[model samples]
Target: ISLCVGCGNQIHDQYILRVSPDLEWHAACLKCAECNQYLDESCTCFVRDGKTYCKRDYIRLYGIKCAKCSIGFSKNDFVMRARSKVYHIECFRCVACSRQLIPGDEFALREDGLFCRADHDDVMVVGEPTLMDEDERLITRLEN
Candidate 1:
C-alpha cells in the first residue's frame, strides 16, 4: 500500500505525487513552501534542509556563487573548483594578467587569493632575472 507523506493517508485511487518509492505526497501537497506554488515536472523543484522549494526560491536560499566574479549560479551550472571555492570556467584565470588557467599551469595560493606562477615569482626570495629593454629607467620592473 502506498501512503501519502503529506496527509498521512493511504493512496489508492487519487492522483498521487511520488518523490521516491518510500516518500510520496498528495498531488495537491507538492508545493513550494515560500510561495505556495504547485510543483510539477515542468517546475524545477528543490529541497533544502528537508523543506521543499521552487527553483528561484531554492537558488536564492542555497545557491553556489563564483568566488572570482561573485555571480550566483544554480547547481546544474558548470563550474571549476579550486581551494574549496567554486568559479565559472571563464572566471578561473591568473590574478595578475588574467591568463586562462589550464590543468598544468603552476599556481600559488596565499592568504588573500590565488596567483599565477610569474606573479608569485615577483614576491619570492629569488628568481632568474628576466630580460628587459635596456636603458629603461626602472628599478623593480622585469619583463620576459
Candidate 2:
C-alpha cells in the first residue's frame, strides 16, 4: 500500500495519482487550496509557498506585474528587477528620452521614472541654497 500526501491516508487501490513530481494523492484528495475543489485535466494548478492554488488564485495572491506594461508574468518568462519593481528588459529604459541602458551605465532613479546621467545633472541644477546645514562640520574634520 502507498501513502497519500494530501489527506494522510493509506492508498487501498492500484491506480497512480500523481499531483506533483514528489507528491502523490488520491483522486479525490487532490484539491485547489483556495477553493478546495478537486483538480482534473481541465483546471490549471500552481504551487506557491508550499500550498497548491488554482491559476486565478495564484495570480490574485502573488502576481508580479511589469512596471511599464502592468501585465503579470507567467511562471517561465524572464523578468528584470530593480529594487522592488519588475520590468521587461525592453521596458526598463529612460522615460524622458526613450534610451535603453546597457550594463555598466550610470543612472539616477526617481520615484516617477528613471533618468540618465545627463538628464540627472540638468534636473539637479536648482541654484545653491543661501544657508549651510550641519553636515558642513564633516568638511573641516576631513581636511585636518
Candidate 3:
C-alpha cells in the first residue's frame, strides 16, 4: 500500500502521493492503531530462527526420570526426584505441616528441606529392600 511521507498517513491525494512516494508496510499498522504505543511483544505470536516462542508455547523440553521406574517424569509434573528417589508432590505431605508438597519445599535435611509429611523415605533405605537376594547374584567364587 502507498503512504504519505510527511505525516505517515494514507496517500489519498495525488499531491501527497507524489511527495510521499509509494510505501509498503509489513503489518496492517506499525504501532497500536488505537493506543499509538509500540505493540507488545507478548501479543506477537510467531516462531522464528528455530528458537522463537512465547512463555506458554514452551514444551518444557525434558525432565528427569524416576530413578526407580525410569519412566515417571521429575520436573513440574507434580512429582519430584531428590535424595536418590522419586515421589509425587501431592502425595508427599510435610510431617510438620501436613501439606503435601515437593520434597525440598519444606522438609530439610541439614540446610533445611530434609523431612516429608510421611516422615518416611528413609524407612526402607540401606536395609534389605525386600526378601530374597534383591536382584539375584548367582553364587560366584569371588574371582573375576
RMSD of candidates 1 onward, in order: 19.5, 19.3, 22.4
Lowest summed lDDT window (length 10), candidate 1: 135-144
Scored by Cα lDDT, where does model 2 land? 0.58
Q: Once superposed on the true structure, which residue ranges of model 1 sit more than 4 Å away at CA?
A: 1-4, 7-13, 33-36, 43-48, 54-86, 110-112, 121-144
Arrange candidates, best TM-score first. Answer: 1, 2, 3
Q: Residue 139, candidate 3: how far off, in angstroms?
A: 30
- Candidate models: Cα lDDT each: 0.58, 0.58, 0.33
Looking at model 2, which ten-residue stretch has the lowest summed lDDT?
Answer: 135-144
- Model 2: colliding residue pairs: none
After superposing candidate 3, which stretches have Cα over 4 Å from the reference?
1-78, 102-106, 109-144
Greater-TM-score candidate between 1 and 3? 1
The Cα RMSD of model 1 versus the native structure comes to 19.5
